[PDB]
Amino acid sequence: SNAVDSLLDSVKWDNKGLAVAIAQNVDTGAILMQGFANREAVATTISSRKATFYSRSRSSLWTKGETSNNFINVHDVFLDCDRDSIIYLGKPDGPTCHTGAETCYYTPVFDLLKEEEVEGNKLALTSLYALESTISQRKAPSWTKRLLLNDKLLCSKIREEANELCETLENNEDKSRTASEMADVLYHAMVLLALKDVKVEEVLQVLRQRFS
Amino acid sequence: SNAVDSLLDSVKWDNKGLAVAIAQNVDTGAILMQGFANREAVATTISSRKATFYSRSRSSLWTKGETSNNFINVHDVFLDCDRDSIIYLGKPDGPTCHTGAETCYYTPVFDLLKEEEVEGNKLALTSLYALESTISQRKAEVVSWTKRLLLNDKLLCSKIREEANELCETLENNEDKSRTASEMADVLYHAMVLLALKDVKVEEVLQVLRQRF
Ligand SMILES: [Zn+2]
Ligand SMILES: [Zn+2]
Ligand SMILES: [Zn+2]
Ligand SMILES: [Zn+2]
Ligand SMILES: [Zn+2]
Ligand SMILES: [Zn+2]
Ligand SMILES: [Zn+2]
Ligand SMILES: [Zn+2]
Ligand SMILES: [Zn+2]
């Protein structure tokens, strides 16, 4: 036949002809959105390289961004082990959620359950991006704030911690010391990034582009 | 009624009483696995802090790791905008897939369209972890610019110190942010070569940072 049809024949579609499709940020890992896909949606994602879904309510194919202009440009596609779940790994043109939120996932359940009569949405973030968010909040006196207001102290720390990290290899120190000094390097380097208005995602795009 | 019951009433369950549940590594962002959850599965994930699902084929609740011991320890739970999709954000005790793979997502589709008769599974990786994997592959092979650094500690440490100073210069000398991003990428790359020599994973570094807050 052809290769795409042969692969699509191997997907474990449900009894409506659908699989779960998850869009994920190729540079950061943030989950952008989750929908469903039929044969045509997956084939169209592959051929067009734009994340394409099937709407159960509209009984219709749709492409993220067809109205909003915020397309997800797809770098790769992965099936899970039993072939009923698909990741579209790609780079968003702009906020993925129709609400304007950066991703569709900003409703924290654990926060809802704490004893406090007040609600607040917040994007789901993994550890590296949570640190970036905390530093950005401090920028807008904690020790992070102290480092944001004393350039010379910060740069002295960045050079000092880089040297300490090197010394874990030069003096054959335990790998736990290496991980701890790398954490120190990363933290102070990210305070500098905040001062320069650079996002971690932008740094990771640079690394991707160099190894392209 | 209590807070969990009130929350579960606000989930947009499908006509089998299910929502999609996605387990995601809290430290790295890797998607570990995706299944379905009913009311009881979400309530049990919240109360036990272990990722819990409903099996459509077995019509039964199950907790990831109940046999394999590779539990996913849940740090937070998120709903999507229209409340029919759930992220279990958590830390796995070990590989999530029953096959032994670290995650359930190792079947790349674009490979099957190449020209050689060959197949090769590989974990889905985002940019930072893809670079980590490339360096590890260079370390494993025998007789390349990355390979040069893996085989010369003194050149490598020289570069790390040099690059850290370059990054500082972008602030001290008020350079454009494009320069700062480029120098941070230099710092990251060379540091990650040292991590490879020390057998340290990026995930272990990010765990350290999370634990400090
Ligand atoms: Zn399986
Ligand atoms: Zn599956
Ligand atoms: Zn949304
Ligand atoms: Zn020292
Ligand atoms: Zn240190
Ligand atoms: Zn919505
Ligand atoms: Zn949804
Ligand atoms: Zn699996
Ligand atoms: Zn440089």
Residue numbers in the entry:
A (entry chain B): 46 to 185, 194 to 265
B (entry chain A): 46 to 188, 195 to 264
From the reporting publication:
The second and third steps of the histidine biosynthetic pathway (HBP) in plants are catalyzed by a bifunctional enzyme–HISN2. The enzyme consists of two distinct domains, active respectively as a phosphoribosyl-AMP cyclohydrolase (PRA-CH) and phosphoribosyl-ATP pyrophosphatase (PRA-PH). In this work, we obtained crystal structures of HISN2 enzyme from Medicago truncatula (MtHISN2) and described its architecture and interactions with AMP. The enzyme dimer is formed by two mutually swapped polypeptide chains, forming a bilobial protein—each domain forms one lobe.
The unliganded protein (with metals) crystallized in the C2 space group with two protein chains in the asymmetric unit (ASU). The X-ray structure of MtHISN2 was solved by experimental phasing using single-wavelength anomalous dispersion (SAD) on zinc cations bound to the protein. However, the MtHISN2 crystals could only be grown in the presence of a low concentration of Zn2+ in addition to Mg2+. There are two unique MBSs in the PRA-PH domain. MBS1 contains Zn2+ coordinated by two carboxyl oxygen atoms of Glu220 and one carboxyl oxygen of Glu217. In MBS2, Zn2+ is tetrahedrally coordinated by carboxylic groups of Glu214, Glu234, Asp237, and a water molecule. The MBS3 is formed by the carboxylic groups of Asp125*, Asp127*, Asp129* and by two water molecules in a shape of a trigonal bipyramid. In the next site, MBS4, Zn2+ is coordinated tetrahedrally by two water molecules and Nε of His143 and by the thiol of Cys126*. Lastly, Zn2+ bound in the MBS5 is coordinated by thiols of Cys126*, Cys142, and Cys149. A metal cation (MBS4) may play a role in priming His143; in the unliganded MtHISN2 structure, His143 does not bind a water molecule but instead is in the MBS4 coordination sphere.
